[PDB]
């Protein structure tokens, strides 16, 4: 069937220009300097991808000898719902298990090789949807972000539509402001962390 040039397995990237604002959701948070947003307008386009991925992976007779290289994109079956997602191979955890990052969501896990499928270039036409972000204007007031600061950040953005504003482009991410416009005096995630002690200015 499909003979794939791995040169043709280039994932696409959302163009986020400085000054772009979009309505999105904070999908996954490591710290205020390491988190992921998705564009709210992605819900349908992504449910569509997921349907295509499910259809495609079901036609693969999932028998063995698939060993992706570090950095390949492939399909990974998420442990919590058993659905198929796009995933970057980050590292092998053993001979038979791999650390993978879900490139449309921002989370990660270690999976059996039995839960990975190769991908084809048709399924890379959607740009990767998890936008890697660093929160503008703040540094951790101890030099390390404490799980309490992170908790608070999670609380400010959970189940909420957030305005993400691109302040700058970094090498592998976007520097952003996060602004909840659902409170009539608008609230910056940066400002609340500064006001609460956890952050200091830069």
């Amino acid at each position: 069937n499909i003979v794939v040039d791995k040169s043709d397995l280039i994932p696409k990237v959302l163009t986020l220009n400085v000054g772009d604002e979009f309505c999105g959701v904070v999908a996954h948070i490591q710290t205020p300097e390491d988190f992921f947003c998705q564009q709210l307008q992605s819900g349908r386009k992504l449910a569509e991808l997921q349907a295509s991925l499910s259809k495609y992976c079901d036609q693969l007779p999932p028998r063995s000898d698939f060993y992706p290289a570090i950095g390949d994109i492939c399909c990974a079956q998420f442990s919590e719902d058993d659905q198929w997602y796009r995933a970057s191979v980050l590292a092998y955890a053993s001979e038979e298990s791999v650390l993978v990052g879900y490139v449309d969501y921002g989370n990660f896990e270690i999976l059996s090789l039995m839960r990975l499928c190769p991908i084809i270039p048709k399924l890379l036409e959607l740009p990767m949807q998890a936008i890697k972000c660093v929160l503008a204007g703040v540094k951790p007031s101890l030099g390390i972000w404490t799980p309490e600061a992170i908790c608070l950040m999670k609380k400010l953005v959970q189940n909420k539509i957030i305005t993400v504003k691109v302040v700058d482009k970094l090498e592998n991410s976007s520097l952003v402001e996060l602004i909840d416009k659902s409170e009539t005096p608008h609230v910056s995630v940066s400002k609340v962390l500064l006001d609460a002690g956890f952050a200091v200015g830069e």
Binding site: A47, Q50, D81, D82, Q83, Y105
Partner: peptide, 4 residues
């Protein structure tokens, strides 16, 4: 959220 997502699907299943």
């Amino acid at each position: 959220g997502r699907g299943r």
